[PDB]
Design a protein around this ligand. Structure first.
Ligand SMILES: [Cl-]
Ligand SMILES: [Fe+3]
Ligand SMILES: [Fe+3]
Ligand SMILES: [Fe+3]
Ligand SMILES: [Fe+3]
Ligand SMILES: [Fe+3]
Ligand SMILES: [Fe+3]
Ligand SMILES: [Fe+3]
Ligand SMILES: [Fe+3]
Ligand SMILES: [Fe+3]
Ligand SMILES: [Fe+3]
Ligand SMILES: [Fe+3]
Ligand SMILES: [Fe+3]
Ligand SMILES: [Fe+3]
Ligand SMILES: [Fe+3]
Ligand SMILES: [Fe+3]
Ligand SMILES: [Fe+3]
Ligand SMILES: [Fe+3]
Ligand SMILES: [Fe+3]
Ligand SMILES: [Fe+3]
Ligand SMILES: [Fe+3]
Ligand SMILES: [Fe+3]
Ligand SMILES: [Fe+3]
Ligand SMILES: [Fe+3]
Ligand SMILES: [Fe+3]
Ligand SMILES: [Fe+3]
Ligand SMILES: [Fe+3]
Ligand SMILES: [Fe+3]
Ligand SMILES: [Fe+3]
Ligand SMILES: [Fe+3]
Ligand SMILES: [Fe+3]
Ligand SMILES: [Fe+3]
Ligand SMILES: [Fe+3]
Ligand SMILES: [Fe+3]
Ligand SMILES: [Fe+3]
Ligand SMILES: [Fe+3]
Ligand SMILES: [Fe+3]
Ligand SMILES: [Fe+3]
Ligand SMILES: [Fe+3]
Ligand SMILES: [Fe+3]
Ligand SMILES: [Fe+3]
Ligand SMILES: [Fe+3]
Ligand SMILES: [Fe+3]
Ligand SMILES: [Fe+3]
Ligand SMILES: [Fe+3]
Ligand SMILES: [Fe+3]
Ligand SMILES: [Fe+3]
Ligand SMILES: [Fe+3]
Ligand SMILES: [Fe+3]
Ligand SMILES: [Fe+3]
Ligand SMILES: [Fe+3]
Ligand SMILES: [Fe+3]
Ligand SMILES: [Fe+3]
Ligand SMILES: [Fe+3]
Ligand SMILES: [Fe+3]
Ligand SMILES: [Fe+3]
Ligand SMILES: [Fe+3]
Ligand SMILES: [Fe+3]
Ligand SMILES: [Fe+3]
Ligand SMILES: [Fe+3]
Ligand SMILES: [Fe+3]
Ligand SMILES: [Fe+3]
Ligand SMILES: [Fe+3]
Ligand SMILES: [Fe+3]
Ligand SMILES: [Fe+3]
Ligand SMILES: [Fe+3]
Ligand SMILES: [Fe+3]
Ligand SMILES: [Mg+2]
Ligand SMILES: [Mg+2]
Ligand SMILES: [Mg+2]
Ligand SMILES: [Mg+2]
Ligand SMILES: [Mg+2]
Ligand SMILES: [Mg+2]
Ligand SMILES: [Mg+2]
Ligand SMILES: [Mg+2]
Ligand SMILES: [Mg+2]
Ligand SMILES: [Mg+2]
Ligand SMILES: [Mg+2]
Ligand SMILES: [Mg+2]
Ligand SMILES: [Mg+2]
Ligand SMILES: [Mg+2]
Lengths: 166, 166, 166, 166, 166, 166, 166
C-alpha cells in the first residue's frame, strides 16, 4: 500500500528534519561563544537539535518498515552562523518550525490522496501534535523576549536565560 | 595563540566528523531493512554515528573556547545507500576511519608548526587514541568476517551479528 | 634530563601562580566590604585564589620530583586594592589569566627546545587546558556584565551576583 | 635434608615454568592481532601465562623455605611468534605441558632417590595433578577444533572462541 | 570605635600571618625533597601553612566588619630554603611562632589603649590561645628531637617522623 | 603512520620492561631468604615486578593496535642474585629505573622525529610520569636508609622495613 | 596394614610433640617474668605450645584409627628454665624444631619400608610441611635478632617484640 510518490516525500521530510537538527546545533554553539554566553539558550537549542534527529530517525524506520528505500541527501548548512541575538534565534526557530509544519501538512495530504491511513496516523501521532506544541512554545518565548525589550535592553535576554530556560 | 589557518582546519575537521556520523547513520538503517535484517550490525553502526557526533561537538566547543569562529558546511550524503553486505560496510567504515585519521594527523602537524600545544594535546587526548582503537576494532571485525566466509557464506554474517556484535 | 634553565623557569612560574592567588584573595575581600557587598563575587574569587595555590603546589612537587631546587621569591602585592567594580575585577582577572597563559606557553616552548617531554606533558595536562577554560569563563562573565550595563546600571552586578555566581 | 642435586633441579624447573609463562604470553598477544582477532583464545592463554608465573613463584618459595639458593637463568623466547592458528597454538601448548610434565616427573624421581618426602609431597600436591588436568583440558580443546574442521573451516575457530572459551 | 592606628596594625598582622604561611609552605616542600624525604614533617608543616592562611583571612574579615580598609603588602620569601634538618625547621618554626606572638601581644596592647574591647576579645578568642598551644607543641617536638639525638643520630628524625607526626 | 624503526624500538622497550620485572622478582625472593628476612622489602619489590609486567603488556597491546609485529627476545637473568642488602637493592633499582627512563626518552625522541604523535602521547601518558615518580620514590628510600646507617647499622633496615614499607 | 614397629614409633613421636609443647610453655612463662617482660615473645611461644599439643593429639587419633595402642610416657621437663634471652629462646626453638623434623623424617622412612602409604601421606600432609615452615619462620626471627644486635643491644629484643611479634 506504499506509493512511490509517498516514498520520495518521506525521504524529503527526512532531509528536512536533519536540516532542522543542524540549524539547532548551530544555534546551540552560537550561544556558547564568549561574546554571547547565554548558556541556557545554548542548552535549550541543543535539546531541540537532538529532538530533530529523533524525528528523522523515526521517519527512517517508517521507511524500512513499509519497505520503502531510504535515500539520503546532503544536509545543507544553516542560513547563518551569526544568529545575532537570543530573540533573533527564537524567531528563526519559530519560522523553521512553521515551515517544517507546512511540509508535514503537505505530506499528510499526499498520504490521504493515496489512501495511506497508516502514514496519516503515523504523522498525526508523532509529528503534527509535537509541531503545534513546538510552535506554541517558541511563540511564547518570542513574545516574552519582545515584551522584556530584547535584544536592546541589556537585562532581558540574561533574565530570560536564567529564569525561563533555567 | 590561535592561528587563523588553525581555525579553518578545525572547521574542516568538524565537517568531517559530521560526515562520518552521517555515513554510520546510513549504515545503521541499511542493516534494519527487511532484506538485510542484521539488527546488531545496525545497533553497532548507530552507536558509532552517535560517537562521531560527540567528536564533532567536542571540536565545536574547542573552537568557542579558543575564541575561533565556527563555520559550518553542508554535510555531504554518504557515497552509497546500498552498503551491499556486513563485510562491505565494515570495510568502508575502516577506510573512513583511516581517512579521518590522516586528516587528524595533518591537523596535529599544522598545530605543531604553529606552536599550538593546547591544540596538539587536545587531539592527542580525545582523537588520536580513539581513532587507533576504532581502526583496530574494525580491522578485527573485517578479518573475522573474511575468515568466516562473508558475504557469500550464508551463516557468517548472521553468526557474527549474533555473537560478536550481540 | 632536567635543564637548569628549566629549573629557573619553573621557579618563576611558581611565583606567578602564587601572585595570582594573592590577586584573587585581594578581590575576594574587596567584594565583602560594606560598600560593595557582592557576596558571590567574593566567593567566586576566593575559590579562584585556592585554585591558584593548588597550581603553585603542583609545580613545587614537580620540582622536587625532577630533583630541581625550589627557590621562592617575594609574593608581590596586587596592583590595586580598589578593584572598583565587579566588571572591573573580572576584566583584571581575565587579563591576569591571559598573561599567566603566555608565561605558560613560553615555558612549554623552553621545555620543547630542551627536549623535556615530561615537562611538556605536565603543562599540557594540568595547566594549558585549565587556563583556556578559565579565560573563556571570565570572558563569558565580562561579556554578560557589559551587556547588562555594569557598573553603571544599578541592577546589573547584583543580578549577576545572585544568578550566575549564585 | 635438602640435596644439592635437588637445589639445582628445582632451579631448572623454575626456569621452565617461567618459559612456559612466556610462551603463553606470546600466544595471548598473537590472538589479539588485527589479522587473528580471537579475543577469547587471547584471554585463555593470558590466564595460563599467569598460572605459570604462579607455579614458578611457588617453587621459588619452596627453595627459600628449604634453605636452598635460587639461581635464575635467562628466560628463552618462545619458538615462534607466528602461532599460525588457534588449533596450532593449542597443539603447541599441549606439547609444552606434556614436556613440562616429564620434567616434573623426573624431579619427583630425583627427590624419591634422595629420600626427600617433603619435596615429593610438594610436587604431588601443587604440580602433578594440575598438570594432568591442564593436559586433559588442552587435549579436549585440540580434539574439538580438529573435529570442527580447524583451521581451514572458516567458522570453527570463531565458534570455539565464542562458545567454549567464552 | 575603630582607630586608624588600629587599622594599620591589623594590616601589619595580616601580612605577618601570610608570611608565616609562606614559611611553613617552604618547609613543607623542603621535607619532600629526595635528599630529605620526611613525609610526615612535610604534611605537618603543610597543615600549619593552611592554618596561617586561615589566621590571615580571619583578620581580613575583621577589617571588613569594622569598616577598616585592608591594605596588602608584598609577602616576603622565607629566610632560607635549606631548612637543614627536621630539628632545625622545628626550632625556626618555634621562633617564628614566638615572634608572631609578640606582635599579637603588642596589637592587644594597642587595642586596650584605644579602648577597643571588640578587638581585644577577637585576639583573645582566636589568636592568643592558639598561639600558646602552637608554641607548646613545637617546644615539645624540639625537645624530643634533641633528646633523641637529632640531627646527627641517623634514626632520630626518621623515628619521630613515623611515630609522633604519623 | 607506524615506522618500522618505531616497531623495532617498541619491541626493544618491551624486552626491557620484562627484564626489569625479572630483576624485581629476583629481589623479592632475595628478601624472603632465611638469612635476610625483610618481608616488606620482599612485598615491595614483588609489587614492582608486577607493575613492570603491566608496563610490558601495555606496549605489546600498542604494537597490536598500530599493526606492528611483536618480536620477543630472551629475558636476561638479573646481574646478581646476591643483592647484598636492602640499601643495595634499592640503589640497584634506582639505577635500573634511571636507565629504563633514558631508553624511554630515546624512544620518545625517535617518535618525534618520525612524526608519530600517537606514540609520543602514549609514552607521555603511561610511562614518563610513572617513571619520574618511581625514581623519586626509590631516591627517597635510598636517602632514608643511608641516613639511618644501613646496611651496617643493625636496626636501620629492619626499622625501615617495618615502618615505611609496612 | 599397621606394623608394630610402626605403633611404637608413633607412640614415641607423640611423646616428642608433647615435650615440644612443654618447652614452648616454659618459654612462654619465662618471657612474662618481671625481669624479662617481653609480652609478645610470651604470646608467640604460648601459641606454639598449643600447636604442639594439637600435633600430639592428631597422632593419638591416628593411633586409635589404625587400631594401634596409645602408650604414654613421662613428659620430660625442658632443658632450662633460664632461657637467657629472646634470641636464645628462638635459637633453642629452632634447634628443637630441627630435631623434631629429623624424628619425623625417620618415621616416614620406617613407614615407607613397611609399605604404609596411609602413614606416609598422613605425615606428608600434617607434619612435614608445617615443620619446614616452622623452621623457616624461626630461622627468620633468629636472623633478624642477630642483625639487630640482640641480646646485648638494649633496643633490639624490645623492638622485635613490639613490631614483628606484635
Ligand atoms: Cl552459535
Ligand atoms: Fe525526545
Ligand atoms: Fe519528546
Ligand atoms: Fe525529550
Ligand atoms: Fe530522548
Ligand atoms: Fe521535527
Ligand atoms: Fe523520545
Ligand atoms: Fe544531495
Ligand atoms: Fe521541530
Ligand atoms: Fe515563555
Ligand atoms: Fe531571579
Ligand atoms: Fe561517547
Ligand atoms: Fe567514548
Ligand atoms: Fe560510548
Ligand atoms: Fe555518550
Ligand atoms: Fe570521529
Ligand atoms: Fe562520551
Ligand atoms: Fe557548504
Ligand atoms: Fe571515527
Ligand atoms: Fe572481531
Ligand atoms: Fe551460539
Ligand atoms: Fe582544585
Ligand atoms: Fe580543579
Ligand atoms: Fe575546585
Ligand atoms: Fe580542591
Ligand atoms: Fe593558575
Ligand atoms: Fe584539585
Ligand atoms: Fe624576592
Ligand atoms: Fe589561573
Ligand atoms: Fe557568564
Ligand atoms: Fe592461580
Ligand atoms: Fe589454580
Ligand atoms: Fe586461577
Ligand atoms: Fe590467582
Ligand atoms: Fe606450570
Ligand atoms: Fe592460585
Ligand atoms: Fe642464563
Ligand atoms: Fe602448565
Ligand atoms: Fe573442549
Ligand atoms: Fe583550621
Ligand atoms: Fe584550628
Ligand atoms: Fe585544623
Ligand atoms: Fe580548616
Ligand atoms: Fe598564625
Ligand atoms: Fe578552622
Ligand atoms: Fe609592599
Ligand atoms: Fe602560628
Ligand atoms: Fe612531641
Ligand atoms: Fe598497576
Ligand atoms: Fe599503577
Ligand atoms: Fe598498582
Ligand atoms: Fe594492577
Ligand atoms: Fe617500567
Ligand atoms: Fe594498573
Ligand atoms: Fe633472543
Ligand atoms: Fe619501572
Ligand atoms: Fe622514603
Ligand atoms: Fe592450630
Ligand atoms: Fe595450624
Ligand atoms: Fe593456629
Ligand atoms: Fe586451633
Ligand atoms: Fe610439632
Ligand atoms: Fe588447627
Ligand atoms: Fe615413662
Ligand atoms: Fe613444631
Ligand atoms: Fe622475622
Ligand atoms: Fe615503631
Ligand atoms: Mg549552500
Ligand atoms: Mg489517530
Ligand atoms: Mg484520520
Ligand atoms: Mg553530491
Ligand atoms: Mg611593590
Ligand atoms: Mg604531548
Ligand atoms: Mg635463542
Ligand atoms: Mg605421597
Ligand atoms: Mg628580600
Ligand atoms: Mg577579655
Ligand atoms: Mg648471560
Ligand atoms: Mg598529552
Ligand atoms: Mg607533545
Ligand atoms: Mg630429668
Amino acid at each position: 500500500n506504499f506509493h512511490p510518490d509517498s516514498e520520495a516525500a518521506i525521504n524529503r521530510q527526512i532531509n528536512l528534519e536533519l536540516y532542522a537538527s543542524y540549524v539547532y546545533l548551530s544555534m546551540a554553539y552560537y550561544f556558547s561563544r564568549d561574546d554571547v554566553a547565554l548558556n541556557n539558550f545554548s542548552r535549550y537549542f541543543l535539546h531541540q537539535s537532538r529532538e530533530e534527529t529523533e524525528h528523522a530517525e523515526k521517519l527512517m524506520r517508517l521507511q524500512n518498515q513499509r519497505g520503502g528505500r531510504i535515500r539520503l541527501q546532503d544536509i545543507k548548512k544553516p542560513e547563518q552562523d551569526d544568529w545575532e541575538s537570543g530573540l533573533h534565534a527564537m524567531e528563526c526557530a519559530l519560522l523553521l518550525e512553521k515551515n517544517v509544519n507546512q511540509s508535514l501538512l503537505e505530506l499528510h495530504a499526499l498520504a490521504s490522496d493515496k489512501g495511506d491511513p497508516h502514514l496519516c496516523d503515523f504523522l498525526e501521532t508523532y509529528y503534527l501534535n509535537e509541531q503545534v506544541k513546538s510552535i506554541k512554545e517558541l511563540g511564547d518565548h518570542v513574545h516574552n523576549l519582545v515584551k522584556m525589550g530584547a535584544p536592546d535592553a541589556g537585562l532581558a535576554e540574561y533574565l530570560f536565560d536564567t529564569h525561563t530556560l533555567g
